[PDB]
Design a protein around this motif. Structure first.
Motif, mmCIF file in Angstrom:
data_model
loop_
_atom_site.group_PDB
_atom_site.id
_atom_site.type_symbol
_atom_site.label_atom_id
_atom_site.label_comp_id
_atom_site.label_asym_id
_atom_site.label_seq_id
_atom_site.Cartn_x
_atom_site.Cartn_y
_atom_site.Cartn_z
ATOM 1 N N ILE B 20 37.124 42.443 46.382
ATOM 2 C CA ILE B 20 35.812 41.844 46.129
ATOM 3 C C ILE B 20 35.433 41.984 44.650
ATOM 4 O O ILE B 20 34.895 41.037 44.044
ATOM 5 N N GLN B 21 35.697 43.156 44.067
ATOM 6 C CA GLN B 21 35.426 43.364 42.652
ATOM 7 C C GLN B 21 36.223 42.397 41.765
ATOM 8 O O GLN B 21 35.684 41.864 40.783
ATOM 9 N N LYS B 22 37.480 42.132 42.134
ATOM 10 C CA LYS B 22 38.297 41.170 41.388
ATOM 11 C C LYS B 22 37.711 39.763 41.502
ATOM 12 O O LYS B 22 37.615 39.026 40.522
ATOM 13 N N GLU B 23 37.327 39.384 42.712
ATOM 14 C CA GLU B 23 36.769 38.058 42.911
ATOM 15 C C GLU B 23 35.454 37.888 42.150
ATOM 16 O O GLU B 23 35.159 36.805 41.669
ATOM 17 N N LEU B 24 34.670 38.955 42.065
ATOM 18 C CA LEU B 24 33.404 38.877 41.331
ATOM 19 C C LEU B 24 33.670 38.607 39.861
ATOM 20 O O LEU B 24 33.007 37.756 39.257
ATOM 21 N N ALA B 25 34.609 39.345 39.284
ATOM 22 C CA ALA B 25 34.953 39.105 37.904
ATOM 23 C C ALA B 25 35.403 37.637 37.758
ATOM 24 O O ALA B 25 34.916 36.937 36.871
ATOM 25 N N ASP B 26 36.273 37.156 38.652
ATOM 26 C CA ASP B 26 36.812 35.798 38.525
ATOM 27 C C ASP B 26 35.733 34.719 38.584
ATOM 28 O O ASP B 26 35.728 33.767 37.782
ATOM 29 N N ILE B 27 34.828 34.844 39.548
ATOM 30 C CA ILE B 27 33.830 33.804 39.743
ATOM 31 C C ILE B 27 32.740 33.846 38.677
ATOM 32 O O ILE B 27 32.052 32.852 38.420
ATOM 33 N N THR B 28 32.588 34.993 38.032
ATOM 34 C CA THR B 28 31.654 35.072 36.924
ATOM 35 C C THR B 28 32.237 34.426 35.684
ATOM 36 O O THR B 28 31.527 33.703 34.977
ATOM 37 N N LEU B 29 33.516 34.697 35.414
ATOM 38 C CA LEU B 29 34.204 34.095 34.263
ATOM 39 C C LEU B 29 34.426 32.598 34.419
ATOM 40 O O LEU B 29 34.248 31.806 33.477
ATOM 41 N N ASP B 30 34.833 32.198 35.615
ATOM 42 C CA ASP B 30 35.272 30.826 35.852
ATOM 43 C C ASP B 30 34.661 30.213 37.126
ATOM 44 O O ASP B 30 35.389 29.784 38.022
ATOM 45 N N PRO B 31 33.323 30.104 37.179
ATOM 46 C CA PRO B 31 32.687 29.584 38.400
ATOM 47 C C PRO B 31 33.062 28.131 38.673
ATOM 48 O O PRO B 31 33.353 27.383 37.734
ATOM 49 N N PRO B 32 33.031 27.726 39.946
ATOM 50 C CA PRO B 32 33.246 26.336 40.317
ATOM 51 C C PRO B 32 32.134 25.520 39.711
ATOM 52 O O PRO B 32 31.038 26.060 39.537
ATOM 53 N N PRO B 33 32.387 24.235 39.385
ATOM 54 C CA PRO B 33 31.297 23.422 38.866
ATOM 55 C C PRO B 33 30.140 23.463 39.872
ATOM 56 O O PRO B 33 30.379 23.425 41.078
ATOM 57 N N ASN B 34 28.913 23.536 39.368
ATOM 58 C CA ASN B 34 27.707 23.403 40.197
ATOM 59 C C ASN B 34 27.424 24.564 41.157
ATOM 60 O O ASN B 34 26.559 24.439 42.020
ATOM 61 N N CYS B 35 28.114 25.687 40.988
ATOM 62 C CA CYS B 35 27.933 26.795 41.913
ATOM 63 C C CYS B 35 27.998 28.142 41.219
ATOM 64 O O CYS B 35 28.758 28.299 40.267
ATOM 65 N N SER B 36 27.208 29.102 41.718
ATOM 66 C CA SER B 36 27.244 30.482 41.204
ATOM 67 C C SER B 36 27.247 31.405 42.415
ATOM 68 O O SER B 36 26.815 31.016 43.479
ATOM 69 N N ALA B 37 27.734 32.616 42.222
ATOM 70 C CA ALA B 37 27.680 33.609 43.311
ATOM 71 C C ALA B 37 27.815 34.999 42.761
ATOM 72 O O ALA B 37 28.469 35.213 41.741
ATOM 73 N N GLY B 38 27.200 35.939 43.464
ATOM 74 C CA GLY B 38 27.380 37.353 43.135
ATOM 75 C C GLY B 38 26.596 38.218 44.100
ATOM 76 O O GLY B 38 25.832 37.705 44.915
ATOM 77 N N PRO B 39 26.772 39.543 44.007
ATOM 78 C CA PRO B 39 26.066 40.471 44.889
ATOM 79 C C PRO B 39 24.557 40.312 44.789
ATOM 80 O O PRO B 39 24.041 40.042 43.704
ATOM 81 N N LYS B 40 23.874 40.477 45.925
ATOM 82 C CA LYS B 40 22.403 40.413 45.960
ATOM 83 C C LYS B 40 21.819 41.694 45.375
ATOM 84 O O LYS B 40 20.684 41.700 44.883
ATOM 85 N N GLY B 41 22.573 42.791 45.494
ATOM 86 C CA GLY B 41 22.082 44.135 45.170
ATOM 87 C C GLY B 41 23.219 45.111 45.094
ATOM 88 O O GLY B 41 24.324 44.748 44.656
#
Lengths: 161, 161
Positions: B20-41
């Motif tokens: 999950i930590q790896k995926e968070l780094a990935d999606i923060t660096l290279d998010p899909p067009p038109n979308c964001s995601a990350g932990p709520k808390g």
């Protein structure tokens, strides 16, 4: 705007794991008399325990197995501790559930699995008919102790040897 | 001897947290067009996501919120992904459950939350009436596309703006 809406725990996992590892070291170095405990396998949340029937008790000579399960909410919620081995005891039912204050309403996070096992040993020595889980056994303890103890010894030989 | 017996996951927790930590780094660096995601808390297993309605789709101009929940069995079991924001779409029901192959039988541990979000965007652009969760919407898409799209645009303005 509620109309706009349609109709596992990182932090606790870290804290519980830290505590459990400390308790494992403690109970390995300094186990309660007549008792051992530790993980069954790779899962640190699932332990086994062996308790020997306390000397002088009606369980003397018995070897009893217990399952100890920690939740991610440990130590804020008590461990779940059950007898796997059948035992004739007014505070311990056929599912192995134990009626002990510190396993329910009287749990405090400062308590250890060593203290819990000590307490269970004390309960095998001195049962608590004021708070039974098996009514018939508790009434028999009060009214026909000889039969109670005969049966407890018989069940020890039958299921715990 | 079965007669003698009465009648959360360390290893998976470690593996899921690493992924999950790896995926968070990935999606923060290279998010899909038109979308964001990350932990709520503080809980790494519970994420929020924002998806913008894909340009050119009947959802254009909408801002949609999704809940993403990982289990300790991630990545061996899929994340649970639901729309929080109401949307008129034959593959997305009133509980926000999404009928997408990769979220169920076609999940593979190699897939990422970035790939899942891309796929959800593709589904908003091109719905799948062959596998609907809302029968009435799917039949309307097939038989009365004009009304389908009018309603989808109306619900976008009403609930996603």
């Amino acid at each position: 705007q509620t109309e706009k809406e349609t109709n596992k725990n990182s932090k606790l996992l870290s804290t519980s794991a830290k505590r459990i590892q400390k308790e494992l070291a403690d109970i390995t170095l300094d186990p309660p008399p007549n008792c051992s405990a530790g993980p069954k396998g790779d899962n640190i949340y699932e332990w086994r325990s062996t308790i020997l029937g306390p000397p002088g008790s009606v369980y003397e000579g018995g070897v009893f197995f217990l399952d100890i399960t920690f939740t991610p909410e440990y130590p804020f919620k008590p461990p779940k501790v059950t007898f796997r081995t059948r035992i004739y005891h007014c505070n311990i039912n056929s599912q192995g559930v134990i009626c002990l204050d510190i396993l329910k309403d009287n749990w405090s996070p400062a308590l250890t699995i060593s203290k819990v096992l000590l307490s269970i040993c004390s309960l095998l020595t001195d049962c608590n008919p004021a708070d039974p889980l098996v009514g018939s056994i508790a009434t028999q303890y009060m009214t026909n102790r000889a039969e109670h103890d005969r049966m407890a010894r018989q069940w020890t030989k039958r299921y715990a040897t």
